[PDB]
Amino acid sequence: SLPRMVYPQPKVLTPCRKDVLVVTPWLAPIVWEGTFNIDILNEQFRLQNTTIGLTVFAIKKYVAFLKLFLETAEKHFMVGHRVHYYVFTDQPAAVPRVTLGTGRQLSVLEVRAWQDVSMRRMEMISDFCERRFLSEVDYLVCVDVDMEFRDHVGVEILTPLFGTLHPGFYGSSREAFTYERRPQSQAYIPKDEGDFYYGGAFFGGSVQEVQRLTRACHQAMMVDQANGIEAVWHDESHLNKYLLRHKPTKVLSPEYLWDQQLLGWPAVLRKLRFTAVP
Amino acid sequence: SLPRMVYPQPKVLTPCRKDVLVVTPWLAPIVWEGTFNIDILNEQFRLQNTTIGLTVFAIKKYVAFLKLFLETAEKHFMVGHRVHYYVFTDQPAAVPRVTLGTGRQLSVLEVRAWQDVSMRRMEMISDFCERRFLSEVDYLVCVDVDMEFRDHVGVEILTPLFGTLHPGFYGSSREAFTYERRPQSQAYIPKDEGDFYYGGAFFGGSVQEVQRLTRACHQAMMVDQANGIEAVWHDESHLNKYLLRHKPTKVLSPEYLWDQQLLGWPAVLRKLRFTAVP
Ligand SMILES: O=c1[nH]c(=O)n([C@@H]2O[C@H](COP(=O)(O)OP(=O)(O)O[C@H]3O[C@H](CO)[C@H](O)[C@H](O)[C@H]3O)[C@@H](O)[C@H]2O)cc1-c1ccccc1
Ligand SMILES: O=c1[nH]c(=O)n([C@@H]2O[C@H](COP(=O)(O)OP(=O)(O)O[C@H]3O[C@H](CO)[C@H](O)[C@H](O)[C@H]3O)[C@@H](O)[C@H]2O)cc1-c1ccccc1
Ligand SMILES: [Mn+2]
Ligand SMILES: [Mn+2]
């Protein structure tokens, strides 16, 4: 039960956005700026005392990205909510000392030091950390570390399972998507199938759904490995196969996964929220 | 896990509908024709073996509406899915013998023979039938009987909690909504609050959410009764107060609750699905 709130009346006969698709054919929202009232969403999630886990791998030289990643997450990611960052690294002492807002904590998880890094992210999330995540957070968001937050990323993304439109392909036809196309791979998608091309750098959902997705991707990747085949874009190829067959309940627009150096700032993007570091 | 399916690729940069709002500010879809691919939704719900309960009251002279209500439900309501109709009447022998498709059954529940009819629908759904519904169906849809189905009403409506835009008010400002305006009533909504005006004739959701909603509306109605006040539109006024404070997870367009005699067939309605009997 939400408290009284005063905000602009939604207007049934006035679309919020007319330039973009805001709902998928299986009735999941596609989250763009203008489509949500964050005050309502914040109330709904706070009333449940929601905790959001953020997983990020920073192995070898990639530890250098953590300072900007974490400082910008503090400014823009789930502010006002409980957050638990899980940083997986082979160099725990290289993790920067970043000051965190109240209600936010960071755990460093030490791992060994691409195909094999790829398999290990799915393996780590689905197998090794399974019990810890179920006990500690409500939702999990799994992201690349070579990124920074430049604008709000909040509870508008939360749902049982979400994927994010890859910023290279949101305007493409399915035939141009770089899905795995060899039928010998568990990630195979035929040319006449496919809704969207989802980016491997930002996906998430409830803990139970994220564990299901990463367990499935890991099992598929191990089958391919035993069959001597490696999918074209590795874990991203398996993520796409999974989300084709298990539709996500929210799709995030490329506001949530962008690269301004390669793609600029198109009129359709009203906010660049989470962006590649050039 | 859905099977392979071949259907038109959704296009991110081509909205499905540009004339109407297709998502609420709390990211619930607003279900209009063109927004959903029923083949995908049918697959998702069948794979869960979904059972849909349909409740309808037909007391006194209103038993005369059951023949057309039920015959048209057989042609258009959840066809292909398991359905259990629950018909509440003071005249069980007046219930028409309507032939049902496979997987569909009808139970007649005998009750006693407006304020008090109104209270009794909420009471009946929340209290008397509580255990039976939890054991027998996954979702419950509660409708008026003076209605007929004229076109598809399917699993695109199913979600934890839905309400339907009342067809008289979908283009109105919140100040014109006929919410209960006296602060002495539990259904009171101030002039600056309100998202939509939902119709009392078609609402539903998972069994647990529908039981929560009808239990809350019944409790509120009893408080008003003890305080000597009756809300302006009875159970509909309390439904509106509930859905203002507990946002629905899907909103149905007025395609799902229409009256062609009073309102015609506007260009914005591509299908008239469930309609008043003139
Ligand atoms: O030494 C590493 N250390 C490390 O921590 N990583 C993590 O993996 C992420 C993905 O690598 P990245 O260099 O960012 O490649 P992208 O092209 O942006 O990755 C996309 O494609 C991948 C395909 O398998 C993934 O799906 C990834 O999620 C995508 O964004 C990084 O952000 C890090 O979090 C990756 C590497 C790495 C190891 C070998 C080759 C290239 C990178
Ligand atoms: O003798 C009845 N028998 C009966 O079964 N009903 C059921 O209540 C429903 C609502 O009554 P109805 O005559 O259809 O009124 P509407 O104006 O279309 O109702 C709307 O407003 C109501 C306000 O309390 C409800 O919210 C209703 O769901 C709305 O559609 C009917 O369709 C029947 O299912 C209603 C009556 C009735 C009893 C006294 C006065 C008017 C109607
Ligand atoms: Mn990256
Ligand atoms: Mn009626």
XYZ file of C-alpha atoms in Angstrom, chain B residues 54-60 62-63 66 85-92 95 106-112 120-121 123-125 128-129 132-133 140 142 145:
38
model
C -14.430 -16.646 -14.180
C -16.883 -15.408 -11.498
C -20.223 -13.909 -12.393
C -23.320 -13.073 -10.287
C -26.733 -13.523 -11.721
C -29.341 -12.864 -9.034
C -33.073 -12.211 -9.606
C -30.218 -11.031 -14.150
C -30.246 -14.779 -14.679
C -26.494 -15.885 -18.553
C -16.884 -20.679 -14.560
C -18.396 -19.935 -11.161
C -21.962 -18.729 -11.497
C -23.509 -17.346 -8.296
C -27.296 -17.277 -8.406
C -30.394 -17.459 -6.237
C -32.002 -19.576 -8.999
C -29.788 -22.548 -9.873
C -28.996 -21.371 -15.236
C -19.072 -24.668 -14.797
C -20.093 -24.709 -11.137
C -23.345 -23.231 -9.869
C -23.085 -21.667 -6.400
C -26.426 -20.832 -4.841
C -26.713 -17.567 -2.857
C -29.479 -15.506 -1.169
C -21.944 -9.538 -1.203
C -19.875 -9.948 -4.413
C -17.676 -10.807 0.494
C -18.374 -13.934 -1.567
C -15.079 -13.785 -3.454
C -16.835 -17.745 1.302
C -15.015 -19.118 -1.745
C -12.057 -23.382 -3.118
C -10.544 -20.862 -5.500
C -9.590 -15.210 -11.193
C -14.614 -11.141 -11.867
C -23.230 -10.633 -16.215
